Amino acid sequence: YGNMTEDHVMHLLQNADPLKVYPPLKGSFPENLRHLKNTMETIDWKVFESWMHHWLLFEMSRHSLEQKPTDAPPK
Amino acid sequence: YGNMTEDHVMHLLQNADPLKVYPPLKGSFPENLRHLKNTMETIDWKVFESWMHHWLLFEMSRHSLEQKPTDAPPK
Amino acid sequence: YGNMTEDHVMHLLQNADPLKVYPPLKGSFPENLRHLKNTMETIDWKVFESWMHHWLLFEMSRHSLEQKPTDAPPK
Numbered sequence: 745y746g747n748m749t750e751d752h753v754m755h756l757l758q759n760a761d762p763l764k765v766y767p768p769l770k771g772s773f774p775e776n777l778r779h780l781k782n783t784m785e786t787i788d789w790k791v792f793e794s795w796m797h798h799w800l801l802f803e804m805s806r807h808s809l810e811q812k813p814t815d816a817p818p819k
Numbered sequence: 820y821g822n823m824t825e826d827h828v829m830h831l832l833q834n835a836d837p838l839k840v841y842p843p844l845k846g847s848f849p850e851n852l853r854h855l856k857n858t859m860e861t862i863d864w865k866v867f868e869s870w871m872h873h874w875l876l877f878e879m880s881r882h883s884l885e886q887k888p889t890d891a892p893p894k
Numbered sequence: 895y896g897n898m899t900e901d902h903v904m905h906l907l908q909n910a911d912p913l914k915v916y917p918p919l920k921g922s923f924p925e926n927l928r929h930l931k932n933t934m935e936t937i938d939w940k941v942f943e944s945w946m947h948h949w950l951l952f953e954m955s956r957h958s959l960e961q962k963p964t965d966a967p968p969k
Binding site: 747749750752753754755756757760761764766769770772773775776777779780784788791792795796799802806807808809 | 820824827828848852856864868869870871872873875876877878880881882
Binding site: 745749752753773774777778781789793794795796797798799800801802803804805806807808811812 | 897899900902903904905906907910911914916919920922923925926927929930934938941942945946949952956957958959
């Protein structure tokens with residue numbers, strides 16, 4: 745679905761909750777994450793980290809592509 | 820990984836919890852979201868909104884592609 | 895953004911929290927999920943399932959592509 749969704753998802757969050765913020769993470773993703781962490785609510789970061797962790801598992805669990813080979817035959 | 824995952828993720832949610840639902844969001848994404856919100860548990864929506872917010876940060880923080888230029892030289 | 899993000903997101907989780915783990919879900923996604931579930935904290939799984947459920951809604955709500963046709967005319 746490409747993008748054009750964060751502004752539509754952000755707005756869906758900017759109207760459902762007046763406390764939803766998305767600070768400009770202009771740094772890099774590891775800065776943008778530590779910034780959201782060092783900036784957003786530590787607890788929203790707690791949850792965001794868990795969101796990234798779930799995001800991580802999911803992608804890992806659903807990474808059927810990357811699969812190491814093994815031993816087909818017995819000997 | 821394309822799609823073919825929501826039915827496999829939905830099933831992973833339809834078996835782990837008998838209270839997991841995914842109402843037909845036939846409207847548009849902003850209707851589908853307000854529907855999940857106006858339909859799903861406000862608290863599941865609270866969490867979903869936070870999920871969209873985390874989903875949003877992540878994508879924003881990890882959006883190394885979109886980067887505004889600046890001033891390389893001092894003068 | 896392709897991938898090269900789970901290791902950067904995992905690290906963002908491996909430094910923010912010393913209890914963040916991502917067990918090798920070498921099985922399939924439905925095994926990797928039931929493994930994270932049967933392995934990770936049931937409560938982290940509770941949240942991960944909710945993360946997959948939110949991940950699911952979002953993708954479904956934002957699936958403007960898949961749209962069944964209807965009746966344009968009245969008769």
